[PDB]
Structure 1
Amino acid sequence: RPGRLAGKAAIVTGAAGGIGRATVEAYLREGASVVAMDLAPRLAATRYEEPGAIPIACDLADRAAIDAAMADAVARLGGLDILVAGGALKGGTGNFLDLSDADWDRYVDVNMTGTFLTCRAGARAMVAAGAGKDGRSARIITIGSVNSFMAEPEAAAYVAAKGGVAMLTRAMAVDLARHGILVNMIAPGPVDVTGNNTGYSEPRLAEQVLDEVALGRPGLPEEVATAAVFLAEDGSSFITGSTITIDGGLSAMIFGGMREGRR
């Protein structure tokens, strides 16, 4: 309860996942009160390595549930200082030519619209709790991806929606600056969320990770969570509309397979 986020009230969505779980834990460790949101069965199966998380189920596909769960969360926290919008469908479908309406809609509705609705409700609660008055500020952090800027193959709906989130983040930063809410995105590269170092073990994918990531491995959840603490703390008071990219150099490098040690 001492810590870099001492006394802050935080909601983390996608909180049963690798990045969300690590963020919930880092946040509790840094003294925040934390509501953990995810799908009901996923929350039911998750136990945090730190105690005190308040689990509240919230299906991002259900618009009424997003509002209800956000109001419930805010009532229980007594306010809202920090929102980490990390809930998302992951992965690919196949070639763009074969991408169905159903899959397009699921990724856009859950990942893009779900983020918008969560963040609009969070932003309104922050303002209602005093953000932008008496020197009080608040924090919205979206979880995007390197896919917000450059495209993986065979995932056009996921990639499109990550671009949607990138620019939603900047629109929110611009409109909410006057309300004392700072809004930024975290863009993770490949992150192993298995707990087992098995997420990227398929040989071809394993070789590609060695060639395309400068550090030559997938990331760990904690390596992303640390940026969620950084963006949320009071000291980040001039950082808004930005992305912190956490990808072992993937997006910084070309012809990584030609480098000494790999070629």
Structure 2
Amino acid sequence: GTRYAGKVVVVTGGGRGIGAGIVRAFVNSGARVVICDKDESGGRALEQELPGAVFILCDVTQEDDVKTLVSETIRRFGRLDCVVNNAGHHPPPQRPEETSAQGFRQLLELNLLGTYTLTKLALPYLRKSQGNVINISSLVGAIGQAQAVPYVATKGAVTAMTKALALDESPYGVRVNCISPGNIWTPLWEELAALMPDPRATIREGMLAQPLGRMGQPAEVGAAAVFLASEANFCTGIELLVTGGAELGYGCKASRSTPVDAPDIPSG
């Protein structure tokens, strides 16, 4: 209700999906929230619906959009307390031979270097407020994922970069943490499934990947982000898993293209 009252928070990719759930969660905690998104439609709708949230058109891959975002946030609101690096993209499934260096580079621009660029420009102001940084990584950065070599690499980089930043910024009292969601039901998840030959079978497999038996919601990642910013004052460099237990226990991992012998020869 007031656990982050009056703090200024920038959320990239805040126009829909997990980012919108983060935006709403910080607004509910009393923060001034600057929505950064390359897409005007969702951000403008959130800005008009939510007082306390304002929208600034900004592509995190463009160094000058991020410089203007930072310049305007300070110019209009006087401080910066929290940066949530959520803007990111997951390509459709691609085998390694179906990936290109050019595509990998483009994905690093958004998923990693957008996060790096905003953080670097935000730090001189976060140091002044003893603010904090929250990166939205992914569970697959930690455990891998099939048909997603470029995406998995960008998220492995984000999680590692979070720890290096935590070390670099701890002398100023600036905490740097990441959230690693598993399967969260979002427009991105829906758009990816709709590319499959059986979208709802894909969605059901995504639900069965969790011991809890469902996907997560954006509001649940949002609650984790407000916790990290407002009540985790002894946490830095941590990776907070919001995954429904997907990393626990044994499961069916041999793919449908993987030769598997009958169970009379169990170990080759």
TM-score range (shorter-chain normalised) is 0.7 to 0.9
Any conservation in 1 of the 2:31–2:52 contact (CA below 8 Å)?
A: no
Match of 1:7 in 2: 6
Any conservation in 2 of the 1:192–1:199 contact (CA below 8 Å)?
A: no
SS in 2 for 1:157: helix
How far off its partner does 1:195 sit?
11
Query: Following the alignment from structure 1 to structure 2, what is the Cα–Cα distance between the partners of residues 126 and 182?
Result: 10
Any conservation in 2 of the 1:24–1:34 contact (CA below 8 Å)?
A: yes
Any conservation in 2 of the 1:29–1:50 contact (CA below 8 Å)?
A: no
Query: Following the alignment from structure 2 to structure 1, what is the Cα–Cα distance between the partners of residues 93 and 62?
Result: 23
Letter in 2 for 1:225: G
Unaligned runs of 5+ in 2: 254-268
Bigger CA radius of gyration: 2
Alignment map for 1:152-231 (pairs within 5 Å): 152-194=145-187, 202-231=199-228
Query: Following the alignment from structure 2 to structure 1, what is the Cα–Cα distance between the partners of residues 59 and 41?
Result: 11
Match of 1:253 in 2: 249
How far off its partner does 1:189 sit?
0.6
Query: Following the alignment from structure 1 to structure 2, what is the Cα–Cα distance between the partners of residues 168 and 82?
Result: 17
How far off its partner does 1:106 sit?
1.2
SS in 2 for 1:72: helix
Aligned-residue sequence identity (percent) comes to 29
How far off its partner does 1:90 sit?
2.0
Query: Following the alignment from structure 1 to structure 2, what is the Cα–Cα distance between the partners of residues 21 and 181?
Result: 24
Any conservation in 1 of the 2:169–2:175 contact (CA below 8 Å)?
A: yes
Alignment map for 1:1-263 (pairs within 5 Å): 3-43=2-42, 46-47=45-46, 50-127=50-127, 130-131=128-129, 137-194=130-187, 202-233=199-230, 235-255=231-251
Give the direction of change, closer, same or farther, for the CA distance of 1:87–1:197 in structure 2 (3 Å limit).
closer
How far off its partner does 1:197 sit?
8.0
Letter in 2 for 1:125: Y
Letter in 1 for 2:239: T
How far off its partner does 1:89 sit?
1.5
TM-score computed with the length of structure 2 as normaliser: 0.85
How far off its partner does 1:92 sit?
3.0
SS in 2 for 1:252: coil
Give the direction of change, closer, same or farther, for the CA distance of 1:97–1:198 in structure 2 (3 Å limit).
closer
Residue by residue, what CA displacement relative to the aligned partner does 1:184-221 show, whole Å, maximum 9, x if unpaired? Answer: 00000111114998976824423422432111111111
SS in 2 for 1:79: coil
Match of 1:261 in 2: none
Unaligned runs of 5+ in 1: 132-136, 258-263
How far off its partner does 1:50 sit?
3.0
Task: Using the TM superposition, name which of 179-188 and 101-110 deviates more.
Answer: 101-110
Residue by residue, what CA displacement relative to the aligned partner does 1:68-112 show, whole Å, maximum 9, x if unpaired? Answer: 211211222211111101011223351112211221011111111
Give the direction of change, closer, same or farther, for the CA distance of 1:198–1:61 in structure 2 (3 Å limit).
closer
Counting matched residue pairs gives 248
Residue by residue, what CA displacement relative to the aligned partner does 1:218-250 show, whole Å, maximum 9, x if unpaired? Answer: 1111011000110010x3110000011001111
Give the direction of change, closer, same or farther, for the CA distance of 1:238–1:112 in structure 2 (3 Å limit).
same
What is the alpha-carbon root mean square deviation over aligned residues?
2.3
Letter in 2 for 1:176: E
Letter in 1 for 2:63: R
SS in 2 for 1:244: strand
SS in 1 for 2:180: strand
Query: Following the alignment from structure 2 to structure 1, what is the Cα–Cα distance between the partners of residues 191 and 67?
Result: 36
Query: Following the alignment from structure 1 to structure 2, what is the Cα–Cα distance between the partners of residues 146 and 44?
Result: 26
Runs of 4+ in 1 over 4 A off after TM superposition: 42-45, 195-201
Query: Following the alignment from structure 1 to structure 2, what is the Cα–Cα distance between the partners of residues 65 and 118?
Result: 10
Give the direction of change, closer, same or farther, for the CA distance of 1:46–1:100 in structure 2 (3 Å limit).
farther
